[PDB]
Amino acid sequence: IFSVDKVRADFPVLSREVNGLPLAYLDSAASAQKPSQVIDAEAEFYRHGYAAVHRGIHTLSAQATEKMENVRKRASLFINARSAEELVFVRGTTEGINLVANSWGNSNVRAGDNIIISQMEHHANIVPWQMLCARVGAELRVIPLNPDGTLQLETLPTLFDEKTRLLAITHVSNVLGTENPLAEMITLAHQHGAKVLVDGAQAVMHHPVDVQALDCDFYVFSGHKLYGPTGIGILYVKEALLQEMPPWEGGGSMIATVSLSEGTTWTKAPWRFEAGTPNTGGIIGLGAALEYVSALGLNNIAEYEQNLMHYALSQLESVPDLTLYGPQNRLGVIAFNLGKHHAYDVGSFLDNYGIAVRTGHHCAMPLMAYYNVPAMCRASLAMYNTHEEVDRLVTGLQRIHRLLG
Amino acid sequence: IFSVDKVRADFPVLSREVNGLPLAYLDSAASAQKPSQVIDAEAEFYRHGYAAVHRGIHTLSAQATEKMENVRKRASLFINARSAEELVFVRGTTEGINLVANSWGNSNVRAGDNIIISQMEHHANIVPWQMLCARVGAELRVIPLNPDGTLQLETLPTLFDEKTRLLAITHVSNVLGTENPLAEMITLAHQHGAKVLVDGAQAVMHHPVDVQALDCDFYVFSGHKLYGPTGIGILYVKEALLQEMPPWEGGGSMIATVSLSEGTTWTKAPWRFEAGTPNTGGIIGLGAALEYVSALGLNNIAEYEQNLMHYALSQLESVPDLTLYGPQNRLGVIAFNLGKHHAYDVGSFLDNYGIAVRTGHHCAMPLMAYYNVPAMCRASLAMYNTHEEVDRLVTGLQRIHRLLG
Ligand SMILES: *Cc1c(COP(=O)(O)O)cnc(C)c1O
Ligand SMILES: *Cc1c(COP(=O)(O)O)cnc(C)c1O
């Protein structure tokens, strides 16, 4: 069983004071706080083992190379990829989607083709496809939303045809908390010979993830939402697809030979997609974050978070004029608006109480437009949040409503 | 005046033992060790101030945004750019060169044009231009080398013509330690209406750098060679050029509006080139590294390093059959080969003595080919290296020569 008090004791920021009051950090979906196991793994690497990591000859560099390839292996086991060499280190979900859009998209999507996204997608999983469509002259098609925040799956027959090259779809919405039926949608997509990129930035911290059972062709997520350091993420690509993809960035470490008269040749996958010095510090910290989450157990995390969410939804019923967005089985986040007040004002009052929520369009403007609002408030309920913090949020919304109503 | 013993006391890795013997880290040109001021600035941010940084409403996020924009301002003053908004945060020199090659290259280099590089360039400043030339059908021209490791500047009239769009040139060679006459070459390049990208990865830690006096159009360098964390670098672009450049990566934070029916519009420079969550941890640490270097004084650093280099070159005269590569006024690095022994073996023996040097082609295969060797050894003499470490290197080369000769 899970003990939130033992977990919170690992997170030094949770002691912080904001505006003179104790912090209630409800914004983990934007970025998670980090346990000291993660902070100290990075610091300890810089203090005792730091070196360049390109199979250098001397000891520190050879050992640093081995630490980095061990994190690649550990990350691959975490998502149950067949092979560590199916994982590419990127700066984050965004860069990983851009790498696919360029390396695989430019050589597999031609004029007259179409790509399918959904209306709930984060901008990271929209803009790179808009750019690709403009480069090659293809069409971007959109799975629309139902009022409860789920996909209208009945529209799929009109959107998939023989020219559909790619479905790019979110595993879990960063605003609605909707989880999409990935396994079925992927089966449908593969019947037309389309590939599927899955945006998993909001999934990997809430429950186990298994890319072999999903059978997705690409999967991406970010370290910093997985209780890890900034500047590091994972792109998973099926081995058969990955060894056909050309390089994106060029430079050191991704070449096999460089000649100014005979041209340049590339090295093998993963490493052909990693140009220049990697973010070794971030990679070490990411490994520690995966060890930490695995030590708690994603199933224990999922159970505690689901209970916390049901408590919060039960308590928020007593907030007058609260509008919620998304399904009742939401994971992780609660998107809401308070009466007619602008989200920006609600968030400012909540910050004044020491409660950190996020306001605005949440990098999902098409989703905001579907609901005909300019912005929403969003509260994240992560594994280190407590019933008392939910109570502070409910009380605060009540006070804001009395004061401003 | 400079005190190497007070400086070394800030670097915890310099106490390390390698193979049972005290480390002599002579590989800073591949990546520098970090002072605890840098390690602790990053750790302290994660411990007390961590949050997402996109002008979020709550306190932690607003303060994190301000820390990041302050580091941008500090970096801009460090290289004497006119404006902080001329600096783009990238993963490193390599990504910065790839960003220029794509965003500016694709819309300014057309079939029939030429680009000029030099024969001493790091792969980071070759491969992105080879890729660009293949994309648009332009020609890559090369300034050749003299035997002493300087550029043959007499060839410039045959290489610059009215179709030359870009000179991409290293400020300081990572192998030879040659410093190139940037100011004059830039004057020549601008007379033909060519832009100049300067690869400054090996310059910013050895002496002051002033992009207004250079008048370069682009300048790039990496945090991790500047005693800072991995995963962070700086790309400087002249404001007039930068506000004309289209985006490269797409996603959150670089858009102004996103619409699935009316298309997407971009935000203003710097920020239009920064998609997704930035590497906030790296940015904080980079700021501390700049404060640290500025507190020592780059002129004090330059003086101590120049003295150390002259001592080393004087001592290495007593090593039999030592071949050196590059000019006598080299900065930072000494590239050498020992008799007929392969660099790999020399480096392995030196590692066995606890001396970390680098061996191989140093991400500069065209440079190796010019000298008709497959590899070289390279010793870096950074601000925290000592006369005693030079003595260990000289003694070691002598022992290796006796043993293997
Ligand atoms: C090391 C170096 C690079 C590559 O920088 P990264 O940090 O690996 O992206 C490019 N040019 C020179 C001269 C270098 O020394
Ligand atoms: C935050 C997030 C992203 C963006 O990830 P970055 O780390 O900023 O690159 C993309 N998709 C979803 C669903 C997210 O929650």
Tab-separated table of N, CA and C in Angstrom, chain B residues 279-371:
chain	number	residue	atom	x	y	z
B	279	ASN	N	14.683	23.667	-21.142
B	279	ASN	CA	15.500	22.988	-20.142
B	279	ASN	C	15.815	23.997	-19.032
B	280	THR	N	14.807	24.254	-18.188
B	280	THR	CA	14.929	25.272	-17.147
B	280	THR	C	16.097	24.983	-16.206
B	281	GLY	N	16.233	23.725	-15.757
B	281	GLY	CA	17.365	23.363	-14.910
B	281	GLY	C	18.697	23.713	-15.549
B	282	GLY	N	18.864	23.362	-16.826
B	282	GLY	CA	20.090	23.709	-17.518
B	282	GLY	C	20.296	25.207	-17.625
B	283	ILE	N	19.217	25.953	-17.873
B	283	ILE	CA	19.317	27.402	-18.001
B	283	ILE	C	19.784	28.037	-16.686
B	284	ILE	N	19.207	27.612	-15.548
B	284	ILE	CA	19.649	28.125	-14.245
B	284	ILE	C	21.137	27.850	-14.040
B	285	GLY	N	21.557	26.600	-14.262
B	285	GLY	CA	22.966	26.260	-14.106
B	285	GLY	C	23.871	27.033	-15.051
B	286	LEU	N	23.409	27.269	-16.289
B	286	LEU	CA	24.201	28.061	-17.231
B	286	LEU	C	24.412	29.481	-16.713
B	287	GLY	N	23.366	30.079	-16.135
B	287	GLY	CA	23.520	31.391	-15.538
B	287	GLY	C	24.573	31.411	-14.453
B	288	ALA	N	24.565	30.401	-13.575
B	288	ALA	CA	25.578	30.342	-12.524
B	288	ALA	C	26.975	30.162	-13.111
B	289	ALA	N	27.102	29.373	-14.182
B	289	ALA	CA	28.417	29.181	-14.791
B	289	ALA	C	28.951	30.491	-15.365
B	290	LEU	N	28.072	31.310	-15.953
B	290	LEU	CA	28.491	32.610	-16.478
B	290	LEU	C	28.902	33.554	-15.353
B	291	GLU	N	28.111	33.608	-14.265
B	291	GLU	CA	28.501	34.373	-13.079
B	291	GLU	C	29.851	33.923	-12.537
B	292	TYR	N	30.071	32.609	-12.455
B	292	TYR	CA	31.338	32.093	-11.944
B	292	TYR	C	32.513	32.516	-12.828
B	293	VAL	N	32.406	32.305	-14.142
B	293	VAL	CA	33.504	32.677	-15.032
B	293	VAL	C	33.750	34.182	-14.979
B	294	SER	N	32.682	34.975	-14.949
B	294	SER	CA	32.847	36.425	-14.891
B	294	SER	C	33.478	36.875	-13.575
B	295	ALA	N	33.188	36.177	-12.478
B	295	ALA	CA	33.810	36.522	-11.208
B	295	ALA	C	35.318	36.280	-11.248
B	296	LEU	N	35.768	35.203	-11.908
B	296	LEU	CA	37.210	34.989	-12.039
B	296	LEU	C	37.836	36.007	-12.985
B	297	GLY	N	37.111	36.398	-14.036
B	297	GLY	CA	37.629	37.299	-15.047
B	297	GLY	C	38.253	36.556	-16.208
B	298	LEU	N	37.666	36.683	-17.400
B	298	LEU	CA	38.187	35.944	-18.547
B	298	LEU	C	39.615	36.364	-18.887
B	299	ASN	N	39.985	37.611	-18.591
B	299	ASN	CA	41.355	38.031	-18.853
B	299	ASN	C	42.332	37.375	-17.883
B	300	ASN	N	41.941	37.228	-16.612
B	300	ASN	CA	42.765	36.461	-15.681
B	300	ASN	C	42.869	35.001	-16.105
B	301	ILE	N	41.748	34.404	-16.515
B	301	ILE	CA	41.769	33.036	-17.015
B	301	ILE	C	42.713	32.932	-18.205
B	302	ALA	N	42.550	33.831	-19.181
B	302	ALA	CA	43.368	33.767	-20.389
B	302	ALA	C	44.850	33.832	-20.053
B	303	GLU	N	45.225	34.707	-19.112
B	303	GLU	CA	46.628	34.838	-18.737
B	303	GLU	C	47.158	33.560	-18.086
B	304	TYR	N	46.436	33.016	-17.100
B	304	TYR	CA	46.893	31.772	-16.484
B	304	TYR	C	46.977	30.640	-17.509
B	305	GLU	N	45.989	30.533	-18.402
B	305	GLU	CA	46.015	29.435	-19.365
B	305	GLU	C	47.157	29.599	-20.359
B	306	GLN	N	47.390	30.821	-20.839
B	306	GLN	CA	48.503	31.028	-21.761
B	306	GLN	C	49.833	30.662	-21.111
B	307	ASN	N	50.026	31.047	-19.849
B	307	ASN	CA	51.250	30.664	-19.154
B	307	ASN	C	51.356	29.146	-19.034
B	308	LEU	N	50.256	28.479	-18.661
B	308	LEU	CA	50.285	27.024	-18.537
B	308	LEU	C	50.648	26.369	-19.864
B	309	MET	N	50.084	26.879	-20.964
B	309	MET	CA	50.365	26.339	-22.291
B	309	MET	C	51.840	26.490	-22.655
B	310	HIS	N	52.420	27.673	-22.412
B	310	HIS	CA	53.836	27.870	-22.721
B	310	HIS	C	54.709	26.946	-21.887
B	311	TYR	N	54.361	26.752	-20.612
B	311	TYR	CA	55.081	25.769	-19.809
B	311	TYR	C	54.987	24.378	-20.432
B	312	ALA	N	53.778	23.961	-20.824
B	312	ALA	CA	53.610	22.609	-21.355
B	312	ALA	C	54.395	22.424	-22.640
B	313	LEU	N	54.305	23.386	-23.559
B	313	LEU	CA	55.043	23.259	-24.813
B	313	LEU	C	56.545	23.221	-24.550
B	314	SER	N	57.018	24.015	-23.592
B	314	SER	CA	58.432	23.960	-23.232
B	314	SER	C	58.828	22.571	-22.718
B	315	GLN	N	58.017	21.979	-21.832
B	315	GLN	CA	58.352	20.667	-21.266
B	315	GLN	C	58.259	19.549	-22.301
B	316	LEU	N	57.276	19.614	-23.205
B	316	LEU	CA	57.097	18.530	-24.166
B	316	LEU	C	58.247	18.428	-25.157
B	317	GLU	N	59.105	19.446	-25.226
B	317	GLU	CA	60.281	19.362	-26.082
B	317	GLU	C	61.183	18.203	-25.681
B	318	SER	N	61.110	17.775	-24.424
B	318	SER	CA	61.934	16.692	-23.924
B	318	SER	C	61.275	15.322	-24.086
B	319	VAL	N	60.243	15.207	-24.913
B	319	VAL	CA	59.628	13.916	-25.210
B	319	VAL	C	60.133	13.468	-26.571
B	320	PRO	N	60.821	12.334	-26.668
B	320	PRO	CA	61.369	11.910	-27.958
B	320	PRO	C	60.259	11.532	-28.923
B	321	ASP	N	60.435	11.916	-30.194
B	321	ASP	CA	59.565	11.493	-31.300
B	321	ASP	C	58.121	11.987	-31.150
B	322	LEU	N	57.927	13.082	-30.426
B	322	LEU	CA	56.618	13.692	-30.296
B	322	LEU	C	56.332	14.527	-31.534
B	323	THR	N	55.211	14.255	-32.190
B	323	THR	CA	54.698	15.102	-33.261
B	323	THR	C	53.550	15.955	-32.725
B	324	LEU	N	53.652	17.279	-32.894
B	324	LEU	CA	52.578	18.204	-32.544
B	324	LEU	C	51.899	18.740	-33.802
B	325	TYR	N	50.627	19.095	-33.665
B	325	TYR	CA	49.816	19.575	-34.774
B	325	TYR	C	49.230	20.920	-34.397
B	326	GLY	N	49.392	21.911	-35.274
B	326	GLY	CA	48.841	23.226	-35.039
B	326	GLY	C	49.896	24.283	-34.782
B	327	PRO	N	49.459	25.526	-34.607
B	327	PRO	CA	50.399	26.640	-34.464
B	327	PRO	C	50.949	26.740	-33.050
B	328	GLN	N	52.046	27.497	-32.925
B	328	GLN	CA	52.681	27.673	-31.621
B	328	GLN	C	51.835	28.523	-30.687
B	329	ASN	N	51.009	29.420	-31.233
B	329	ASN	CA	50.114	30.232	-30.417
B	329	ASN	C	48.766	29.549	-30.134
B	330	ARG	N	48.715	28.220	-30.132
B	330	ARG	CA	47.478	27.496	-29.850
B	330	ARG	C	46.828	27.928	-28.534
B	331	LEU	N	45.493	27.946	-28.526
B	331	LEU	CA	44.692	28.128	-27.320
B	331	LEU	C	44.144	26.789	-26.850
B	332	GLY	N	44.274	26.518	-25.556
B	332	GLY	CA	43.504	25.439	-24.923
B	332	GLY	C	43.925	23.989	-25.081
B	333	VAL	N	44.209	23.550	-26.310
B	333	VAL	CA	44.420	22.137	-26.598
B	333	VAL	C	45.771	21.932	-27.268
B	334	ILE	N	46.359	20.771	-27.005
B	334	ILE	CA	47.566	20.313	-27.677
B	334	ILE	C	47.219	18.991	-28.350
B	335	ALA	N	47.254	18.969	-29.673
B	335	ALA	CA	47.076	17.734	-30.421
B	335	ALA	C	48.451	17.179	-30.760
B	336	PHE	N	48.662	15.890	-30.485
B	336	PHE	CA	49.960	15.263	-30.702
B	336	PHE	C	49.786	13.796	-31.082
B	337	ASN	N	50.870	13.213	-31.589
B	337	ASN	CA	51.022	11.773	-31.742
B	337	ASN	C	52.414	11.406	-31.244
B	338	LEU	N	52.547	10.198	-30.713
B	338	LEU	CA	53.791	9.751	-30.095
B	338	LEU	C	54.435	8.726	-31.015
B	339	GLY	N	55.574	9.089	-31.599
B	339	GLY	CA	56.275	8.175	-32.483
B	339	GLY	C	55.330	7.563	-33.483
B	340	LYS	N	55.461	6.252	-33.670
B	340	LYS	CA	54.580	5.503	-34.555
B	340	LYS	C	53.447	4.807	-33.815
B	341	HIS	N	53.316	5.005	-32.506
B	341	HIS	CA	52.281	4.312	-31.752
B	341	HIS	C	50.907	4.883	-32.071
B	342	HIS	N	49.893	4.024	-32.044
B	342	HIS	CA	48.568	4.542	-32.320
B	342	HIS	C	48.069	5.354	-31.134
B	343	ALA	N	47.417	6.475	-31.445
B	343	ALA	CA	46.873	7.338	-30.405
B	343	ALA	C	46.067	6.548	-29.380
B	344	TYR	N	45.276	5.584	-29.841
B	344	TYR	CA	44.485	4.778	-28.924
B	344	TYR	C	45.355	4.136	-27.830
B	345	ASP	N	46.538	3.618	-28.196
B	345	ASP	CA	47.409	2.997	-27.199
B	345	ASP	C	47.991	4.037	-26.254
B	346	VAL	N	48.487	5.154	-26.790
B	346	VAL	CA	49.006	6.220	-25.937
B	346	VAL	C	47.949	6.647	-24.923
B	347	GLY	N	46.721	6.884	-25.394
B	347	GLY	CA	45.660	7.290	-24.482
B	347	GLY	C	45.347	6.239	-23.431
B	348	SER	N	45.428	4.954	-23.801
B	348	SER	CA	45.146	3.889	-22.833
B	348	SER	C	46.204	3.835	-21.741
B	349	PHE	N	47.479	3.976	-22.111
B	349	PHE	CA	48.516	4.058	-21.090
B	349	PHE	C	48.342	5.300	-20.234
B	350	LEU	N	48.046	6.447	-20.853
B	350	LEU	CA	47.867	7.659	-20.058
B	350	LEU	C	46.700	7.511	-19.091
B	351	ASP	N	45.606	6.877	-19.530
B	351	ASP	CA	44.497	6.608	-18.613
B	351	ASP	C	44.942	5.704	-17.469
B	352	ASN	N	45.818	4.736	-17.762
B	352	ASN	CA	46.292	3.817	-16.736
B	352	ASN	C	47.111	4.548	-15.676
B	353	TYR	N	47.729	5.682	-16.039
B	353	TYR	CA	48.372	6.597	-15.099
B	353	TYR	C	47.406	7.586	-14.448
B	354	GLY	N	46.104	7.494	-14.723
B	354	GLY	CA	45.158	8.450	-14.174
B	354	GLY	C	45.071	9.771	-14.905
B	355	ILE	N	45.607	9.845	-16.119
B	355	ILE	CA	45.600	11.050	-16.935
B	355	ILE	C	44.546	10.881	-18.025
B	356	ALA	N	43.518	11.731	-18.007
B	356	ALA	CA	42.443	11.663	-18.997
B	356	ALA	C	42.754	12.617	-20.152
B	357	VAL	N	43.102	12.051	-21.310
B	357	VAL	CA	43.186	12.769	-22.574
B	357	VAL	C	42.169	12.141	-23.523
B	358	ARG	N	41.973	12.767	-24.675
B	358	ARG	CA	41.079	12.205	-25.676
B	358	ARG	C	41.875	11.704	-26.875
B	359	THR	N	41.418	10.603	-27.468
B	359	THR	CA	42.042	10.059	-28.663
B	359	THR	C	40.980	9.837	-29.729
B	360	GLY	N	41.427	9.728	-30.971
B	360	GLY	CA	40.500	9.487	-32.053
B	360	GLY	C	40.490	10.620	-33.057
B	361	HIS	N	39.388	10.772	-33.779
B	361	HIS	CA	39.341	11.794	-34.808
B	361	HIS	C	38.750	13.108	-34.309
B	362	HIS	N	38.286	13.162	-33.064
B	362	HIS	CA	37.883	14.418	-32.443
B	362	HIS	C	36.791	15.146	-33.217
B	363	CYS	N	35.904	14.362	-33.827
B	363	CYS	CA	34.803	14.884	-34.611
B	363	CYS	C	35.304	15.859	-35.670
B	364	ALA	N	36.505	15.570	-36.184
B	364	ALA	CA	37.126	16.374	-37.242
B	364	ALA	C	37.871	15.482	-38.244
B	365	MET	N	37.153	14.567	-38.898
B	365	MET	CA	37.816	13.647	-39.818
B	365	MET	C	38.487	14.353	-40.991
B	366	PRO	N	37.910	15.397	-41.600
B	366	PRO	CA	38.643	16.077	-42.687
B	366	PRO	C	39.979	16.635	-42.230
B	367	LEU	N	40.044	17.123	-40.988
B	367	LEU	CA	41.305	17.588	-40.412
B	367	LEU	C	42.306	16.447	-40.248
B	368	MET	N	41.855	15.288	-39.751
B	368	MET	CA	42.734	14.121	-39.664
B	368	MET	C	43.253	13.728	-41.041
B	369	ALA	N	42.365	13.700	-42.040
B	369	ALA	CA	42.767	13.322	-43.388
B	369	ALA	C	43.787	14.305	-43.965
B	370	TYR	N	43.621	15.610	-43.700
B	370	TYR	CA	44.612	16.572	-44.179
B	370	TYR	C	46.008	16.225	-43.674
B	371	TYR	N	46.111	15.775	-42.426
B	371	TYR	CA	47.394	15.447	-41.831
B	371	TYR	C	47.803	14.001	-42.078
